[PDB]
């Protein structure tokens, strides 16, 4: 299962 | 003799041959996000077993993978600024996953690369980020301070990832834990004034294998070359190993092969 | 940072006339990921060709597998790799 949502770099 | 679940995500800015997102259990690919499809798709029969308990598996992974694709477009734009690059073709890569060892210890990693060089990675054990250079220190900042999100990642790497890995291993054990016997063939190359003895070893699974040319029974590395360990389309592997041998001396050399498919090692001569 | 492909060509089984086989061309250790890999039979691109998805190793370099079913006979098989690090296209011939 993929990881959830990401944050801006 | 551990097992792992591994995701590999690739984003390129000026086009080519054009986003890529692939999932593995022990170097068997089981899912991929076809940036054409915009769907996270099954790549093997056994992953559909996830549907009885989690009928939303494909939508959830699709929405997340789509989210990651859009985030990576943003990342590529921001890193151009961080490195002050007017703009060529650039690459952003993300790898993450977990390892479950046979002793029931575990590990995990979570890493990003820009243009093929390390950019930033999460240190799970200190809950801080390792920036590879001074531009990445911009990213180390926002992220070091996001205590809650950093814990989601530790939780994901240490628990969520391991739990799925353990589910997947049971789902796909019949093919993930199979063994296929190496097929060893020795050929001999030139008649005209030394000979190269080639040992072709193919059709083996899993990937781990010990192949050595011996000389009077001893491991021999002089004038010995070897190929890549390369995948066949049926998920089995192939490689070769060569030695330059002498006039009149062929019978001293045997190709020695050790593998899980061989209860005893084999020694093959020309 | 630019890295040239390491390439290898092979059949799934050692060839036999009339016995069906799979011809593979495999590239690894290259960067950036844009790469074109063409299976050739007697210099003509093969039909019915398949290619794996794009993955990479822990050193970030990319891998790509390209293959096609084929029936050998005593006809030549090769692989044409084009990449940013290769000024001319490079042909890898399969022997045996």
Domain boundary among B126, B156, B178: B178
Question: Residue B128: inside a domain, yes or no?
Answer: yes
- Note down the domain range covering B190: 179-264
Q: Which residues of C touch B228 (CB under 8 A)?
A: 6, 8, 26, 28
Q: Which residues of C touch B238 (CB under 8 A)?
A: 10, 12, 24
Query: Are residues B30 and B131 both part of a single domain?
Result: yes
**Residue owning tokens 């944050």:** A7
Q: Is the dihedral of CA B254, B255, B256, B262 positive or negative?
A: negative
**Contact flag C31-B234 (C-beta cutoff 8 Å):** no
Neighboring chains of A (3 or more beta-carbon pairs < 8 A)? B
How far is CA C7 from each of CA B118, B140, B203, C29, C84, rounded to the nearest angstrom?
A: 25, 37, 19, 9, 15
Question: Residue B107: inside a domain, yes or no?
Answer: yes
B and C: number of Cβ contacts within 8 A? 92
Query: Are residues B56 and B79 both part of a single domain?
Result: yes
Query: Are residues B120 and B3 both part of a single domain?
Result: yes
Question: Residue B269: inside a domain, yes or no?
Answer: no
Query: Are residues B232 and B118 both part of a single domain?
Result: no
What is the Cα–Cα distance from B119 to B132, expressed in whole angstroms?
A: 5
Resolution for this experimental structure (Å): 2.5
Query: Are residues B174 and B209 both part of a single domain?
Result: no
Q: Is B260 on the interface with C (CB under 8 A)?
A: no
B26: alpha, beta or left, given left = phi > 0 and alpha = psi -120 to 50?
left
How far is CA B214 from each of CA B118, B207, B257, rounded to the nearest angstrom?
A: 40, 22, 10
The approach used to solve this structure was X-ray
Question: Residue B270: inside a domain, yes or no?
Answer: no
Query: Are residues B120 and B44 both part of a single domain?
Result: yes
Among residues C51, C6, C27, the alpha carbon closest in space to that of B32 is found at C51
Spatial contact of C26 and C64, defined as CB atoms under 8 Å apart:
yes
Among residues B270, B125, B131, B254, the alpha carbon closest in space to that of B191 is found at B270
What is the Cα–Cα distance from B30 to B201, expressed in whole angstroms?
A: 26
Question: Residue B249: inside a domain, yes or no?
Answer: yes
**Residue owning tokens 């999100």:** B149
Query: Are residues B251 and B222 both part of a single domain?
Result: yes
Mutation site, A3, A4, A5, A7, interface B, largest B CB count within 10 A: A3
**Contact flag B89-C31 (C-beta cutoff 8 Å):** no
What is the Cα–Cα distance from B120 to B94, expressed in whole angstroms?
A: 10
Using N-to-C axis directions, what is the helix angle for B136-144 and B147-155, rounded to 10°?
Answer: 90
Query: Are residues B5 and B139 both part of a single domain?
Result: yes
Rg for chain A, CA atoms, rounded: 8
Domain boundary among B132, B159, B178: B178
Q: Is B132 on the interface with C (CB under 8 A)?
A: no
Q: Is C29 strand, coil or helix?
A: strand
> Which member of B67, B78, B153 has the closest CB to residue A9?
B78
Q: Which residues of C touch B183 (CB under 8 A)?
A: 13
Q: Which residues of B touch C92 (CB under 8 A)?
A: none
Query: Are residues B37 and B140 both part of a single domain?
Result: yes
How far is CA B163 from each of CA B4, B106, B159, B166, B184, rounded to the nearest angstrom?
A: 11, 11, 6, 5, 38
- Among all residues of chain C, which has the CA nearest to that of B9? C55
Question: Residue B38: inside a domain, yes or no?
Answer: yes
Query: Are residues B14 and B137 both part of a single domain?
Result: yes
Q: Is the dihedral of CA B122, B126, B128, B132 positive or negative?
A: negative
What is the Cα–Cα distance from C14 to B210, expressed in whole angstroms?
A: 21
- Breaks, C-N > 2.5 A, in chain C lie after 74
Report the domain count for chain B: 2
Query: Are residues B70 and B166 both part of a single domain?
Result: yes
Q: Is B263 strand, coil or helix?
A: coil
**Residue owning tokens 């007017």:** B86
What is the Cα–Cα distance from B111 to B66, expressed in whole angstroms?
A: 19
Query: Are residues B260 and B173 both part of a single domain?
Result: no
Residue B61, min C-alpha distance to chain A (Å): 6
Residue A2, min C-alpha distance to chain B (Å): 6
Question: Residue B189: inside a domain, yes or no?
Answer: yes
Task: Locate B24 and state its tokens.
Answer: 């593995």
Domain boundary among B178, B196, B211: B178
């Amino acid at each position: 299962h993929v990881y959830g949502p990401l944050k801006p770099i | 003799s551990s097992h792992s679940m591994r995701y590999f995500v690739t984003s390129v800015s000026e086009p080519g041959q054009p986003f890529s997102y692939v999932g593995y259990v022990d170097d068997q690919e089981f899912v991929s996000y076809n940036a054409s499809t915009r769907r996270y798709l099954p790549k093997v029969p056994w992953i559909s077993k996830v549907e009885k308990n989690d009928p939303d598996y494909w939508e959830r992974n699709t929405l997340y993978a789509q989210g990651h694709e859009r985030s990576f477009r943003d990342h590529l734009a921001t890193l151009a600024e961080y490195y002050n690059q007017s703009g060529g073709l650039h690459t952003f890569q993300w790898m993450y996953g977990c390892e479950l060892r046979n002793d029931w210890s575990k590990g995990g990693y979570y890493q990003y690369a820009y243009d093929g060089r390390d950019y930033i990675s999460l240190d799970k054990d200190t809950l801080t980020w390792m920036a590879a250079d001074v531009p990445a220190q911009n990213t180390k900042r926002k992220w070091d301070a996001d205590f809650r999100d950093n814990e989601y990642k530790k939780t994901y790497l240490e628990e969520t990832c391991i739990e799925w890995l353990q589910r997947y291993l049971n789902y796909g054990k019949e093919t993930l834990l199979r063994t296929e016997v190496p097929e060893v063939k020795v050929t001999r190359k030139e008649d005209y004034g030394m000979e190269t003895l080639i040992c072709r070893v193919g059709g083996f699974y899993p990937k781990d294998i010990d192949i050595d040319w011996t000389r009077d029974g001893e491991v021999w590395l002089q004038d010995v070359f070897h190929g890549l360990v390369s995948p066949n389309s049926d998920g089995t592997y192939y490689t070769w190993r060569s030695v330059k041998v002498d006039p009149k001396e062929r019978e001293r050399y045997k190709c020695h092969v050790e593998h899980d498919g061989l209860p005893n090692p084999v020694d093959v001569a020309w | 940072t630019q890295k040239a492909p390491s390439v290898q060509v092979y059949f799934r089984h050692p060839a036999e006339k009339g016995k069906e086989n799979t011809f593979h061309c495999y590239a690894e250790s290259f960067h950036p990921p844009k790469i074109n890999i063409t299976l050739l039979k007697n210099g003509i691109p093969m039909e019915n060709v398949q290619q794996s998805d794009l993955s990479f190793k822990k050193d970030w370099t990319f891998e790509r597998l390209v293959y096609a079913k084929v029936i050998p006979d005593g006809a030549e098989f090769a692989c044409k790799v084009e990449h940013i690090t290769l000024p001319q296209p490079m042909i890898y011939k399969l022997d045996q």
